[PDB]
Design a protein around this ligand. Sequence first.
Ligand code: HEC
Ligand code: HEC
Lengths: 108, 108
Amino acid sequence: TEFKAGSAKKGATLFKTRCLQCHTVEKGGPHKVGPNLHGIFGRHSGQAEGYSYTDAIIKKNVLWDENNMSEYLTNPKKYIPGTKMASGGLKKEKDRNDLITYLKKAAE
Amino acid sequence: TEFKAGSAKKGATLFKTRCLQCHTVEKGGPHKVGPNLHGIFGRHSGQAEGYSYTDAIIKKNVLWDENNMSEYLTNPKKYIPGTKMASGGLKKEKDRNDLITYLKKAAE
Ligand code: HEC
Ligand code: HEC
């Protein structure tokens, strides 16, 4: 990979401070500004049901792997021009690594 | 993605004619020349237990997604220099697509 396992604990707190505002990760969690992320890994972009995605994300049709998720998080709009995810991104690979480690584990 | 779903039926027969010689895909299937492929998607390269992999594959530490699997199949040795998988590859994207479609489904 080009993703290195980080601290799932560190990633949990990054999630809460950077992602929670718009998303849930638990199975059965609701869509909010952003879609619930349970089971995101291996799923393609813009496929959660009952969520209204941008045309851009559906069509980018990104396959979510720890690798892909990394570029996305780096700079969402640069990666999927047109996305309405209003996040400036996680510029440090160390933060991304911790977050993805946490997300790999909690969205399963 | 850059992978398009094909014919799972077509992929089953490509598997049997090109992959079966060295691999099994069923859960509980044994390692043969090549490792059993059950649950390969989302797993990193060189991690099936009880199989003796090349140094190269372990270290390539490729994360298996439909996308990755595609490049691999295209030309194994060009993608993982040092691998002992003795396959010349699947040059047509249409064949790859059918195979991966089948593999996505059978290795789950
Ligand atoms: C609101 C201010 C958000 C914050 C903070 C984060 N995300 Fe987000 N996300 C948001 C929206 C509005 C959308 C949908 C975009 C669209 O163009 O329709 C998303 C989407 C995602 C995705 C893609 C989901 C898919 O089903 O394809 C992922 C993987 C994602 N968001 C993850 C994520 C993470 C891990 C965040 C914290 C670093 C995060 N987002 C912040 C809104 C918002
Ligand atoms: C014997 C002549 C093989 C044929 C035909 C195919 N594969 Fe293979 N595969 C083979 C070996 C000896 C190995 C291990 C390589 C090493 O360097 O140790 C592999 C490995 C794979 C992998 C990687 C597995 C992992 O656990 O990381 C995959 C995804 C794979 N093989 C798939 C595959 C497919 C789909 C094939 C048909 C087109 C196929 N292989 C042919 C041996 C042989």
